[PDB]
Design goal:
Elements: H1 12-16, E1 18-21, E2 27-29, H2 31-35, E3 43-45, E4 51-56, E5 61-66, E6 76-77, E7 84-91, E8 101-109, E9 114-126, E10 129-140, E11 148-155, E12 161-168, E13 171-176, E14 179-186, E15 194-204, E16 212-224
Antiparallel strand pairs: 1-2, 1-5, 3-4, 4-16, 5-15, 6-15, 7-12, 7-16, 8-9, 8-15, 9-10, 10-11, 12-13, 13-14
Bound molecules: a molecule of 2 linked components (BEM-BEM).
Length: 226
């Protein structure tokens, strides 16, 4: 009794270029599975046509991982001259009690390091400034450095919001509803790495391991160019 996101043509291309991971890193549905009507409590189309991801547990995820239509995994040069762009229209609902951070978009390297996470956070303190209920960009400072540079992008709203990630020439930019909120952040620390996009709900440090994080996407696409 779940409608598949594949029933909406606006998702055909991204699903053809994705695989779904749930609840950890193992793939539960490949592109062909997704295109053939895959749907479950953790991944389904709502009545008003959002692709909704839902998951409970610490560091558990319901997440799409960028793929090539060939079936190759996406593995583009993180710092190369070819622009890689991810665009999404995301409605972040008020999260259930005990949900503290939910990652909704990533640039991830082809090993174990997220280059960028865009996440909702209940709270965050950056250089002495605490912000409540915001959308955050987190860029890891290196593969061998567990620390990250964090940037507030937006006050959380339930309204559908346009996010754009543009990666090119060792820099990364983020726009929110068309306004630049992170302007050519350096990611040269991933020279020599390959990268891919992810999108969905990835539940970070919940205080209630039973609560469900929940994220809705009205549009989603990832492209490259030159
Ligand atoms: O909480 C920390 O100690 C560090 O977490 C970092 O983000 C994590 C994130 O919580 C997820 O587990 C993800 O899978 O891996 C990320 C990682 O880079 O290890 C950063 O938030 C960092 O600022 C924290 O120091």
């Amino acid at each position: 009794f779940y409608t598949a996101p594949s029933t909406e043509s606006k998702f055909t291309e991204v699903l053809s270029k994705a695989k779904l991971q749930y609840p950890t890193s193992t793939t539960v549905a490949f592109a062909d599975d997704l295109l053939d009507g895959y749907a479950a409590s953790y991944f389904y189309l709502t009545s008003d046509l959002y692709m909704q991801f839902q998951v409970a547990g610490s560091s558990q995820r319901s997440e799409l991982r960028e793929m090539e239509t060939s079936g190759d995994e996406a593995a583009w040069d993180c710092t190369g001259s070819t622009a890689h762009v991810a665009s999404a229209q995301i409605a972040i609902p008020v999260q259930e009690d005990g949900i503290e951070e939910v990652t909704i978009l990533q640039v991830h390297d082809s090993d174990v390091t997220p280059v960028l996470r865009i996440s909702w956070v209940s709270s965050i303190t950056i250089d002495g400034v605490t912000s409540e209920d915001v959308v955050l960009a987190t860029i890891r400072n290196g593969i061998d450095d567990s620390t990250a540079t964090k940037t507030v992008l937006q006050a959380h709203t339930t309204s559908r919001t346009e996010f754009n990630i543009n990666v090119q020439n060792s820099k990364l930019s983020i726009t929110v509803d068309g306004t630049t909120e992170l302007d050519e952040a350096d990611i040269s620390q991933f020279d020599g790495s390959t990268c891919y996009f992810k999108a969905g709900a990835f539940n970070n440090n919940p205080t209630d391991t039973s609560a469900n994080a929940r994220i809705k996407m009205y549009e989603l696409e990832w492209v490259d160019h030159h």
